[PDB]
Design an enzyme around this catalytic site. Structure first.
Site, short mmCIF file in Angstrom:
data_model
loop_
_atom_site.label_atom_id
_atom_site.label_comp_id
_atom_site.label_asym_id
_atom_site.label_seq_id
_atom_site.Cartn_x
_atom_site.Cartn_y
_atom_site.Cartn_z
N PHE A 179 -26.66 42.62 73.27
CA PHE A 179 -26.26 41.85 74.44
C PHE A 179 -27.05 42.38 75.63
CE2 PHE A 179 -23.57 38.85 76.60
CZ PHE A 179 -23.62 39.27 77.92
N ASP A 288 -31.91 49.44 77.59
CA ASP A 288 -30.94 48.77 78.43
C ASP A 288 -29.72 49.69 78.51
OD1 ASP A 288 -28.82 47.31 79.43
OD2 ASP A 288 -29.32 45.48 78.32
N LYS A 319 -23.79 47.76 86.59
CA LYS A 319 -22.37 48.08 86.42
C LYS A 319 -21.92 49.35 87.16
CE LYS A 319 -21.56 45.75 81.95
NZ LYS A 319 -20.39 44.84 82.14
N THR A 343 -35.09 37.37 96.82
CA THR A 343 -34.66 37.43 98.21
C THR A 343 -34.05 38.79 98.56
OG1 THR A 343 -34.26 35.03 98.23
CG2 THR A 343 -33.25 36.34 99.96
C1 LIG Z 1 -25.94 46.20 77.77
C2 LIG Z 1 -25.85 45.08 78.77
N1 LIG Z 1 -26.97 44.45 79.21
C3 LIG Z 1 -26.94 43.45 80.10
C4 LIG Z 1 -25.75 42.95 80.65
C5 LIG Z 1 -25.78 41.81 81.64
O1 LIG Z 1 -25.36 42.25 82.93
P1 LIG Z 1 -24.62 41.24 83.93
O2 LIG Z 1 -23.26 40.87 83.33
O3 LIG Z 1 -24.38 42.01 85.21
O4 LIG Z 1 -25.52 40.03 84.12
C6 LIG Z 1 -24.45 43.55 80.24
C7 LIG Z 1 -23.16 43.02 80.85
N2 LIG Z 1 -21.97 43.16 80.00
C8 LIG Z 1 -21.13 42.23 79.79
C9 LIG Z 1 -21.33 40.87 80.39
C10 LIG Z 1 -20.49 40.07 79.43
C11 LIG Z 1 -20.60 38.61 79.39
O5 LIG Z 1 -19.89 37.97 78.57
O6 LIG Z 1 -21.42 38.05 80.17
C12 LIG Z 1 -19.72 40.82 78.61
C13 LIG Z 1 -19.90 42.30 78.93
C14 LIG Z 1 -19.92 43.23 77.73
O7 LIG Z 1 -20.46 44.35 77.87
O8 LIG Z 1 -19.38 42.88 76.66
C15 LIG Z 1 -24.50 44.66 79.26
O9 LIG Z 1 -23.38 45.30 78.82
#
Ligand SMILES: Cc1ncc(COP(=O)(O)O)c(C/N=C2\CC(C(=O)O)=C[C@H]2C(=O)O)c1O
Ligand SMILES: Cc1ncc(COP(=O)(O)O)c(C/N=C2\CC(C(=O)O)=C[C@H]2C(=O)O)c1O
Ligand code: FES
EC number: 2.6.1.19
Lengths: 461, 462
Positions: A179, A288, A319, A343
């Site tokens: 993810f 990541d 986070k 921006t």
């Molecule tokens: C390793 C990793 N890489 C990128 C991102 C993306 O960040 P942003 O959310 O800030 O765009 C996340 C965010 N984590 C989750 C977001 C979410 C959902 O269903 O969207 C469920 C959460 C979960 O960890 O299960 C993350 O853990």
């Protein structure tokens, strides 16, 4: 700084939450809402809802609250008249940075730079961190393949109309169970749940298997070693295959621990070998740490456990870091401005908060605390696993980044719902897993609070 | 509330800025930085830099500051002890919203909902606004195709590995000169400058020409209706062409006024006709008001000038709105949760600011002021276009959202450096244009003050 323990008044969600959820459901699908919260009365490890329930929070806003709710050092920050401007005058950071911009980065992100990464660009969330990391890598790989040579204006003409060769057919390699975010670039590298992906156009990028370990780890050493080698071989095959498809893999992205895909761990040896493969095939190695970064595994960045002086080419975060962004090696520094740009590029108000957070983490020794509270928590979960094998399997964790599997999704959800009614907030991942994402002020006594509650729940289940 | 004139002390960037810039250039490419700022001393329309300079700000942080710097009502917000929690306890809004979340939306975004759009989802920036607008549009189109039936087994299995039918081959139609953001979905609908697009993989989606109007509008009425008409015909041809190539157009995205592409305008008639072309082919109509939104055209949303009861299906916003997000029609509401989702979905601290910002725009009638002060502005430029036809051409605008062209790139840059040294900050779009993005507390006398300064700059220009 904290409460004594949970204090429950109603079922969760209670009547005031259900009414507020009813109102919100008018303007958007609010089916995901768990309950509504009183952040003013929440403190430390404890989340308070609008019905006066006080729960021990082991979810921490999807692992994004670093040092608990309403931390007194952060309250003081906001009370200072000198900081008012940071909160009401948001700059276009890439053109008009505020005076203290470098000094605040020195007090925060730069003070925890990963090994071998001199460069830092800030971003507002984990998705645009990973997207702009993809683009940084695509530009680096093209710069490799063109020298020396400048932009051919065939490329400059094609790129404006989404056409080769201005728009190359490079790929990013990702892993099943990964993810990395929800915007359409990240989504292509995400392979967590069908509901995240279904009906969205994607990219034809190589997807590799992530090792599935067998537990107890100490009984399955040979088989876990074989599984990891299998996955490493398939990664290498895919790079060669997609090179021959003219879809050359410019980078590899991986999480040190796969979170939303079901808390999938792999050995430190696996990641060191994967980093080597990436170098061997000229792929940028993108780590990541959006979810593993910020200290819950006992080190500030989870990849530190690998023991490498050269752990990665790029590392993204968000986070717990309040702001997003990515560190990278100097050789990925873009040659020209305005290619990696937007921006806001984050928000200096988040940097102001993060500098105080990092100062608390270091002075209160919270990396070592997370290693300790996590061992205590994991020891207790292993004990519960032995006492209730009809409900608990595959207990696993590093620091407080812990989880276990239940028989099916239905049972997972009932246990989470009961634990919430008994004053403990838990999160799920994967099909049937329960995960722990405590804030960094979670202590061994909070581990025991939870384990005692969960013991009585599993007894009555 | 405001200073009453620029106050210069050094050239720009001054010595301290160049030092700060060298420091920043160690950790990242800092070639884009103009100068460093003392926001604590900035006020209303005036941006104070670290070398003590005070300039009239007609760029407002790429059109993102709504009611000027350090506004005392926003100051009064941050100092209320009730608001501390909002700034330091950031929730995962999609799962654990704060108690006042709906009411604060009522005080803010919901009170300026565009016509026909009862739904609202918030986002943190313009790029994830448009990205999630795209996904909402793709989900709605597939829902039309599959009806009230469940996901198929094959769809559930193939979407996990980036393959059809789980991942469809839908497209979004966009326009040349468009800018819709920098993430990879947004980027494929962006067609502004080559430096934004080169070396990044993209999507084979349809790109339509945007109408290039000839000026003065008075003089080219038939040429311009002809230009707009053929653009409309190519739009329709692309939809037909991409449906047979099995890359069905699910939606159309367009800005009411293209910004980064060179301040390209088009008639209200053009957008009304494009709106109907979209509906006629079953395409969602996505209107990107990230830059035009917030009131600078004299109406809160630019598309309000079109005079439609059904102006669009989806409308994204950001910048001046502090938070991002998008309004949309009820039929675009996702059937199931967790399809449109991310950790933060914006930020309650921004909503708290926007509610006070929107109260001030209404209580102090800043929409009228923008249409009025924008007229004085645009009137002035036309006079300066007449007196200096060798430099300024195609003076255009709507409200304070004005621009003009110069002969080439070098004169564009030189005018900006001169004007900034003289105490006024201007931005540039396209290869050779000068744009005006003033805050909403920009007034009559700020117009005139810029007009008088640019006048003397004009009389001494080589
Ligand atoms: C390793 C990793 N890489 C990128 C991102 C993306 O960040 P942003 O959310 O800030 O765009 C996340 C965010 N984590 C989750 C977001 C979410 C959902 O269903 O969207 C469920 C959460 C979960 O960890 O299960 C993350 O853990
Ligand atoms: C019309 C428009 N649309 C999207 C973006 C992208 O916003 P962000 O820069 O906030 O991602 C911009 C800038 C913009 O003008
Ligand atoms: S994509 Fe990161 S905040 Fe919008």
């Amino acid at each position: 700084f904290d409460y004594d323990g949970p204090l429950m008044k109603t079922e969760v969600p209670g009547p005031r939450s259900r009414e507020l959820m009813k109102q919100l459901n008018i303007i958007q699908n609010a089916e995901a809402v768990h309950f509504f919260c009183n952040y003013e009365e929440s403190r430390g490890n404890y989340l308070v809802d609008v019905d006066g329930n006080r729960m021990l929070d082991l979810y921490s806003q999807i692992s994004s609250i670093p040092i608990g709710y309403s931390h007194p050092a952060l309250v003081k920050l906001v009370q200072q008249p000198q900081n008012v401007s940071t909160f009401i005058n948001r700059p276009a950071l890439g053109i008009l940075p505020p005076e203290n911009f470098v000094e605040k980065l020195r007090e925060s992100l730069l003070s925890v730079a990963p090994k071998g990464m001199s460069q830092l660009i800030t971003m507002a969330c984990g998705s645009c961190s990973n997207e702009n990391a993809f683009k940084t890598i695509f530009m680096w790989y093209r710069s490799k393949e063109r020298g020396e040579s400048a932009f051919s204006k065939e490329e400059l003409e094609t790129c404006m109309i989404n056409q080769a060769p201005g728009c190359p057919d490079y790929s990013i390699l990702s892993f099943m169970g990964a993810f990395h975010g929800r915007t359409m670039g990240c989504l292509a590298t995400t392979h967590s749940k069908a509901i995240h992906k279904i009906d969205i156009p994607s990219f034809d990028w190589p997807i590799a298997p992530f090792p599935r370990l067998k537990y107890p780890l100490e009984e399955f050493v040979k088989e876990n070693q074989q599984e990891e080698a299998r996955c490493l071989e398939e990664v290498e095959d895919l790079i060669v295959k997609y090179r021959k498809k003219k879809k050359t893999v410019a980078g590899i992205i991986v999480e040190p621990i796969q979170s939303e895909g079901g808390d999938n761990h792999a050995s430190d040896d696996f990641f060191r070998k994967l980093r080597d493969i990436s170098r061997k095939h000229g792929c940028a190695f993108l780590v990541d740490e959006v979810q593993t970064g910020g200290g819950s595994t006992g080190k500030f960045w989870a990849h530190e456990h690998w023991g490498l002086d050269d752990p990665a080419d790029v590392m993204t975060f968000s986070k717990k870091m309040m702001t997003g962004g990515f560190f990278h090696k100097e050789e990925f520094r873009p040659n020209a401005p305005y290619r990696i740009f937007n921006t806001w590029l984050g928000d200096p108000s988040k940097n102001l908060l993060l500098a105080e957070v990092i100062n608390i983490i270091k002075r209160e020794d919270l990396l070592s605390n997370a290693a300790h509270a996590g061992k205590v928590l994991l020891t207790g979960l292993l004990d519960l696993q032995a006492r209730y094998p009809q409900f608990i399997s595959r207990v696993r964790g590093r620091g407080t980044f812990c989880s276990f599997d239940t028989p099916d999704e239905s049972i997972r959800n009932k246990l989470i719902s009961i634990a919430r009614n008994k004053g403990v907030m838990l999160g799920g991942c994967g099909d049937k897993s329960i995960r722990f994402r405590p804030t960094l002020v979670f202590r061994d006594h909070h581990a025991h609070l939870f384990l005692n509650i969960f013991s009585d729940i599993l007894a009555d289940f």
